[PDB]
Design a protein around this nucleic acid. Structure first.
Ligand SMILES: [Mg+2]
Ligand SMILES: [Mg+2]
Ligand SMILES: [Mg+2]
Ligand SMILES: [Zn+2]
Ligand SMILES: [Zn+2]
Lengths: 162, 174, 39, 38, 38, 42, 99, 177, 108, 156
RNA sequence: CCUACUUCACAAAGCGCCUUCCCCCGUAAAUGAUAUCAUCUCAACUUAGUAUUAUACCCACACCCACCCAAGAACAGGGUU
């Protein structure tokens, strides 16, 4: 990879570009005919939000996502990775990828409401005060509909709204 | 101990004598109630972990009454403590750097002129009072045709509900 | 339940068409067979 | 009851609702998704 | 802000962003064009 | 270090006494699983 | 009239009680109720719910034997589903044929 | 067996204490196991007249985890009898006010609505932290397994496992991150 | 090797099918509780009645445990003892008392 | 055909490997020789049986009673070989039938004691406002059997 | 609440006197990706941003014929040194 170094040295700043070493692909993919990295390893429909070994390859060091032109994913497997890393940030996973900040974290907010499969942002949902009748209830969305096409073993599909 | 800013000290039990006018240097007239501290004594102390885990408590006794008219356990308590029995016993929430020894006297110079106190007692009981003296309702008019309805509460609910709410204002002991 | 029983040719309700139903329920102690059951 | 033609989408008999539920268009599914193939 | 069921940018400088669960149209040049999805 | 019986109870003492009863039944050849009496004719 | 109408409810409630007790014992053995009933009937042993609940309460070794049988026939069915047979169609399969 | 009659019936109809951890479990999946073992439905000697109930001791109930956005949408609602006394609070506000309330309300909902429900809830012992009193720790048998798997965040990944997983793509070497 | 159930609790099953094919054989001997899965019995020997002056003052002390409560606290004590609610320990009327079987049937 | 380890790559249940059928057949031979030797040397006692009789299934032991709801055309005192024994079991071994055990393994003897009616069971119908009110009283016949012996033979 | 005034008077009242303490959320702003700019964030996050995990009352298990009471329909309650 590449990084920028700034040296303030006697009223004279030096802005240097330096290339550090980068990893590469493992030496034998099982399907070299595939286009994506997900197709090239037969990983299509095979991952959930738990797989942070898989998700932490496609993210910046502060938790941000990486573009499709750099990673090489397709459009539909990008948005599955993009939404899965949002559900893994909120679920307490990936703790070394916190956002950078000078000193702001010191007013500790509301305590560890532990969550998982969180789909929306926690500060943008109004509480379901009224719940509707029996025939049109207002459900809580759980998980994401982009991962409806994941492989299912339970002989009953993913209950996405409950 | 010396006073810290987060502190709460004990109070008293006084006996309301009467009222009196009282004038200030600008000319205005205020009325005062004379509370006399007759015979006040700290009775027993309960530490912070022994009541609710929040604040320590102190018991304080009121004016002296006869031994011949109390229960046996109360007389045993005052016999162990060493005081004549008291009429009323109140519990004061204090912080534990303000604890006092049980059996001590509390006086009226406990408070100083220029301070603010909060007094709490049983109000004057007025018996089974009707709704106009109790809740300040209006009645119905007097003579323009009214039949046996001069001080009644009137309607007590609406028609749909089929009951009256629990918070309803009705006659009762006041 | 049985609908697997139809794939073996066995009449899904096991209380009809079998040896469990059509055999005689009892016999005498000295070996004589029973009179036939009415069903 | 309402006419055969109405203004308000006219909720069907439940047997007809089951019939229109069981006869929906099902698109063909490729074996390998065509972009995932070269 | 005005409540609209279908937002549209009325000028070049309006920019469509999603905040607190809604789609908003903000504008800094002409603040009339501020809209808010209802 | 080898089990010979096991008995339940509401205290430790009555469970120990019941365990003694269970071992004492098992020794004498009188358990509830014994051969029932052979009513027949030889 | 209640005494006459109660007979059907008695039979229904007794079978629901047997289903509850068999579910309890099988879930003690880590088996679900449908797996037990289905894979027991696939070994051609025709025990009804009454004697299965009575074996669950009074003969727990025989119920562990039955739960082991149902689990083995379940595993044989799964390997048959992966292999389509080929070779052996299991062992605790191969129904006995009557003519 | 052979089990003289009153010891035998005592052994069969005795009560068992169970321990169930909270700590990143959903409250409904705890409530299901607690409801089954409070009614006594896990015993083959079950009957609703027999009072074959067991005790369930749940710890760490302050560290439960709702799936999805149920911490901000699920609303617990009561009523004082008086007019103007309708109170509705989210799961977060109720969990902060009383740390033990969400699991208690779930277990109370799943139980049958007959007159045994209050006694079966009296056999429920719920604690918000790792601390459990000494008698209740002396009664315990059989910590029940947890339903959820606790999906194991990245810093706990035991570097041989990172050596197992392959690198799926080659980044451009002149890229900043 | 393969066993369909864990073989540590209650029983040890082997499943066998006959050479004829017409009967399934299950062999299941019981498993005992081995010696190292048992803690020893605690031996409570609490004795603090001996004062040196008398000897039968401890026999006097043996009957020093008596208490009277009214219905409320007694019901609260029984409720917190047996983990029930309060509604058991109240009495019943004559009607509910005198229509209850005092000679019930007895199976076994 | 390689997939790296993720949450959904492999099935969640553990992979079961059923045994080799030849060694399993030899093992079945060894177990049935054990159980046949246990029968022939007499290492059982108080064995029970599940018996299909009169459209029900009776979990039956020795010396008990069963009451069936129909006549049998049998005078009391006569002994009966209840066939269709579909499970036999002692302590430490059971034998299952498919569906019925053989006639030579198990042999359940039973004696009839008492042939009675039932207590009168009331059948009544009612429909409101229709003047509909029927009433019957039905006493069905019954028979009491007493299961004497459940023997077993080493033919296995 | 009765010390002044007033209806009145060993009381009750107003026309008379005393006391009366925490928020609430729609938006306005930094850093920053998806989309190397930019972007307030149903992206991870930082502020205005939450008053409450609020404090005051009330919490003594059985002397009770009888008398009195500012306590009271009866009952209950307080005093009888
Ligand atoms: Mg008027
Ligand atoms: Mg008139
Ligand atoms: Mg009049
Ligand atoms: Zn692809
Ligand atoms: Zn604009």
């Amino acid at each position: 990879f590449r990084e920028v170094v700034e040296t303030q040295e006697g009223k004279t700043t030096i802005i240097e570009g330096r290339i550090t070493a980068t990893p590469k692909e493992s030496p034998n993919p099982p399907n070299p005919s595939g286009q994506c990295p997900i197709c090239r390893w037969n990983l299509k429909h095979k991952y959930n939000y738990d797989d942070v070994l898989l998700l932490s390859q496609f993210i910046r060091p502060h938790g941000g996502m990486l573009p499709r032109k750099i990673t090489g994913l397709c459009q539909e497997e990008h948005r599955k990775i993009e939404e899965c890393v949002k559900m893994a940030h909120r679920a307490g996973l990936l703790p070394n990828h916190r956002p950078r900040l000078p000193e702001g974290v010191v007013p500790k907010s509301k305590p560890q409401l532990n969550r998982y499969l969180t789909r929306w942002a926690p500060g943008s949902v109004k509480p379901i005060y009224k719940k509707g009748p029996r025939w049109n209830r207002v459900r809580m969305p759980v998980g994401s509909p982009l991962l409806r096409d994941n492989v299912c073993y339970s002989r009953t599909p993913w209950k996405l709204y409950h | 101990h010396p006073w810290e800013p987060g502190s709460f000290r004990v109070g008293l039990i006084a006996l309301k004598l009467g009222m009196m006018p009282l004038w200030t240097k600008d000319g205005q007239k205020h009325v005062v109630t004379l509370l006399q501290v007759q015979d006040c004594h700290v009775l027993k102390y309960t530490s912070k972990e022994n009541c609710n885990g929040k604040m320590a408590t102190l018991s304080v006794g009121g004016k002296t009454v006869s031994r011949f008219r109390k229960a046996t356990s109360i007389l045993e308590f005052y016999r162990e403590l060493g005081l004549p029995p008291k009429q009323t016993v109140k519990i004061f929430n204090i912080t534990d750097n303000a604890a006092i020894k049980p059996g001590t006297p509390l006086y009226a110079a406990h408070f100083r002129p220029g301070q603010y106190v909060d007094v709490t007692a049983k109000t004057i009981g007025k018996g089974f009072q009707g709704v106009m003296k109790r809740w300040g309702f209006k009645g119905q008019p007097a003579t323009h045709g009214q039949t046996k309805t001069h001080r009644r509460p009137g309607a007590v609910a609406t028609g749909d509900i089929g009951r009256v709410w629990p918070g309803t204002k009705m006659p009762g002991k006041m | 339940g049985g609908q697997w029983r139809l794939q073996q040719g066995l009449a899904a309700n096991p209380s009809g068409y079998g040896p469990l139903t059509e055999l005689p329920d009892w016999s005498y102690a000295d070996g004589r067979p029973a009179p036939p059951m009415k069903g | 009851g309402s006419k055969a033609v109405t203004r308000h989408r006219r909720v069907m008999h439940f047997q007809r609702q089951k019939l229109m539920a069981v006869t929906e268009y099902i698109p063909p599914k490729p074996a390998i998704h065509p972009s995932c193939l070269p | 802000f005005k409540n609209k069921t279908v937002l549209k940018k009325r000028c070049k400088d309006c920019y469509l962003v999603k905040r607190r669960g809604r789609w908003y149209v903000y504008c800094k040049t002409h603040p009339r064009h501020k809209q808010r999805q209802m | 270090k080898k089990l010979i019986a096991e008995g339940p109870g509401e205290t430790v003492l009555v469970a120990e006494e019941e365990a003694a009863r269970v071992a004492l039944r098992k020794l004498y050849g009188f358990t509830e699983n014994r051969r029932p009496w052979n009513y027949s004719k030889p | 009239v209640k005494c006459t109408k109660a007979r059907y409810l008695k039979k229904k409630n007794m079978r629901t009680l047997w289903i509850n007790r068999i579910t309890a014992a099988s879930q003690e053995h880590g088996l679900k109720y449908p797996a037990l009933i289905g894979n027991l009937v696939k070994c051609q042993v025709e025990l009804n719910r009454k004697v299965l609940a009575d074996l669950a309460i009074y003969e727990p070794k025989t119920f562990k034997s039955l739960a082991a049988l149902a689990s083995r026939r379940r595993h044989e069915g799964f390997a048959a589903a992966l292999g389509d047979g080929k070779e052996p169609e299991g062992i605790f399969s191969r129904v006995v044929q009557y003519h | 067996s052979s089990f003289s009659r009153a010891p035998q019936q005592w052994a069969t109809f005795a009560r068992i204490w169970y321990l169930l951890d909270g700590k990143m479990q959903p409250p409904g999946k705890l409530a299901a196991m607690a409801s089954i073992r409070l009614q006594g439905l896990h015993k083959p000697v079950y009957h609703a007249l027999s009072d074959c109930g067991d005790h369930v001791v749940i710890m760490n109930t302050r560290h439960i985890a709702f799936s999805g956005n149920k911490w901000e949408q699920k609303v617990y609602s009561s009523h004082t009898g008086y007019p103007g006394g309708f109170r509705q609070v989210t799961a977060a506000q109720l969990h902060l006010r009383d740390p033990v309330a969400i699991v208690k309300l779930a277990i109370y909902g799943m139980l049958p609505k007959n007159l045994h429900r209050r006694t079966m809830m009296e056999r429920l012992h719920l604690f918000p932290d790792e601390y459990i009193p000494e008698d209740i720790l002396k009664n315990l048998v059989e910590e029940l397994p947890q339903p959820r798997k606790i999906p194991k965040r990245l810093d706990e990944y035991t570097q041989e496992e990172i050596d197992a997983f392959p690198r799926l793509w080659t980044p451009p070497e002149d890229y900043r991150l | 090797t393969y066993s369909p159930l864990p073989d540590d609790y209650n029983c040890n099953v082997e499943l066998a099918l006959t050479s004829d094919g017409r009967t399934i054989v299950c062999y299941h001997p019981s498993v005992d509780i081995p010696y190292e899965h048992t803690k020893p019995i605690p031996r409570p020997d609490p004795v603090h009645n001996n004062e040196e002056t008398h000897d039968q003052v401890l026999k006097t002390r043996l009957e020093e445990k008596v208490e009277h409560l009214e219905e409320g606290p007694m019901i609260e004590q029984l409720s917190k003892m047996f983990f029930t609610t309060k509604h058991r320990w109240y009495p019943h009327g004559r009607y509910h008392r005198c229509r209850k079987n005092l000679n019930p049937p007895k199976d076994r | 055909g390689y997939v790296p380890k993720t949450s959904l790559s492999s099935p969640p249940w553990p992979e079961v490997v059923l045994p080799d059928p030849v060694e399993e057949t030899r093992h079945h031979a060894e177990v049935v020789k054990k159980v046949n030797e246990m029968i022939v040397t007499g290492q059982y006692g108080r064995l029970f049986a599940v018996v299909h009789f009169a459209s029900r299934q009776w979990k039956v032991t020795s010396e008990d009673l069963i009451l069936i709801g129909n006549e049998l055309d049998l005078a009391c005192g006569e002994r009966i070989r209840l066939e269709k024994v579909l499970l036999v079991g002692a302590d430490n071994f059971t034998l299952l039938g498919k569906p019925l055990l053989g006639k030579d393994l198990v042999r359940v003897e039973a004696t009839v004691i008492e042939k009675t009616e039932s207590w009168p069971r009331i059948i009544m119908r009612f429909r409101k406002r229709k003047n509909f009110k029927k009433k019957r009283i039905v006493t069905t016949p019954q028979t009491v059997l007493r299961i004497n012996s459940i023997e077993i033979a080493p033919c296995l």
